[PDB]
Design a protein around this ligand. Sequence first.
Ligand code: TMP
Ligand code: TMP
Ligand code: TMP
Length: 563
Amino acid sequence: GKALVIVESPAKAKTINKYLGSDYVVKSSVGHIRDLPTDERGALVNRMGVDPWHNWEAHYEVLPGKEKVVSELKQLAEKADHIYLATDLDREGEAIAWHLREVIGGDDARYSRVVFNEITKNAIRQAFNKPGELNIDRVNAQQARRFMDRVVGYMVSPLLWKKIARGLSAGRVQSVAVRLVVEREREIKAFVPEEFWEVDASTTTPSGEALALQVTHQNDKPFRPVNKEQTQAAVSLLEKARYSVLEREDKPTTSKPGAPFITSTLQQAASTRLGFGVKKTMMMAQRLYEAGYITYMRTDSTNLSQDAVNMVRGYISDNFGKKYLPESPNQYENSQEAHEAIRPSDVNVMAESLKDMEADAQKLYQLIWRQFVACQMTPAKYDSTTLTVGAGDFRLKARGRILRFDGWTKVMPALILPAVNKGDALTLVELTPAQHFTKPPARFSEASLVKELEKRGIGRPSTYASIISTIQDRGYVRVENRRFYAEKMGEIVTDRLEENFRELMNYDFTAQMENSLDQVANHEAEWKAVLDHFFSDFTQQLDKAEKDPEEGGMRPNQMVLTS
Ligand SMILES: Cc1cn([C@H]2C[C@H](O)[C@@H](COP(=O)(O)O)O2)c(=O)[nH]c1=O
Ligand SMILES: Cc1cn([C@H]2C[C@H](O)[C@@H](COP(=O)(O)O)O2)c(=O)[nH]c1=O
Ligand SMILES: Cc1cn([C@H]2C[C@H](O)[C@@H](COP(=O)(O)O)O2)c(=O)[nH]c1=O
């Protein structure tokens, strides 16, 4: 007579309830109900909860206090015809659905796995309209990841306690992430600032208009004196030279809006524009999502549904007008790549209209809403001017720009050279030398590290945040003034791992393991075979590391005296 639906949080249960008829009964497991504990060694296998030596047999256990929840689901599941696992759409979500089906038990046919990337009326109806089945491959991909992380963490760390210090930790991806910071910390430590000069000139057009120029070439070669003498010498020539205009290339340019956000880009924009850290951004993104205000916050897809594009184009026509609406929609699909960007669930809901959301949560929505609306508006137009000037053997230039049509920038908050013809004489009024110095590489920010992680194909929309968090409370790196700093212990452990766990620390291999995980999720590889391969390369590394250093083993945090 009735159906039972299960979600992972009360917040998600409340929102989805508003869209499910009387035939359905929503219930939230209130978190993960079951999971792992909080050549061979029964002692090690028990602590890990997985057995690399008996074809990866696992020992999952119902989490503390959640035993009341199981019974809550159990008895509830019997007074129902069908059971719907409406956990989030990601692999982690697929595995949580699995654990739910396992615990409650029952014929596999009593279960369905619904997928949706936003909690709205029409998204909920279609999700339960054409329900799906649990996908064991995605579940196996998720456990594969969980098993190798456990292996690395529980088997490397003990070597580190013995070789380096007690309490240390090792992380499959985390240690690779720390490597990037350590390398960046070193580049900076060895950087040598270099001196170079620049010369500016103030002139007067024939009218009397002021014109500022920068010296670009001398003898047709790029101008860049490296000291104080060279500049004065150049300055001394520029003082007697006759200045004249020799081209006014007036060219029309445009700026295009960015694509709708994906996990990584949201984090960077939120951090750079709103000063939000990765943890903060993802926690608020989640609440907006579970509140039904935005699409799933874990994605690497910039695709937008026809419906979403139709609703926003409508908003653009009504609120901005025809000159802001492109002829055809901007397209940034099918079987693969069938997800969506982070966009509001209803373009007609303004940040100021969010009910149960805090100030910064509304601000994040605004940033998301603006990016979304802008991505579907026309480009902005400018008329760029470039004045090249000649003076003796020198060449100087001045650039200028005038806005002609705001286009997409209209939905963003509210925010020029004189007239001269080729051949006009400019009067020199003043010359101004300026000394500068090459700066060192920028320090990673929480988000810009994720950015670097993404381009190296190391992270994953659903792991970036955890990766940033997990490497901070361990003494390897620290964030000071919102920037990363490598700690001495971070370098100590990093050099050790690169020396005795090369494959594990290699970027390409780490990015490759993500591909391998995708092949599992796509039934192109079998999770256990993939795990056996990983363990094989791992233990060979580990066995070598545990040996005395005189036999090539890991270096202890030594430093001995004359004796
Ligand atoms: C939890 C998790 C999710 N995902 C995601 C992001 C997307 O929502 C989806 C990709 O779809 P797929 O698993 O069918 O290939 O799963 C990963 O790729 N790795 C993970 O570890
Ligand atoms: C040091 C610092 C930088 N920022 C910046 C400067 C950049 O605009 C942005 C991150 O820059 P990045 O992508 O080059 O790493 O955030 C802050 O917002 N707060 C800070 O405390
Ligand atoms: C993408 C984009 C965002 N912004 C933003 C994001 C911030 O929410 C906003 C500054 O905050 P404000 O609107 O509250 O004054 O500016 C731009 O100014 N230009 C852009 O091109």
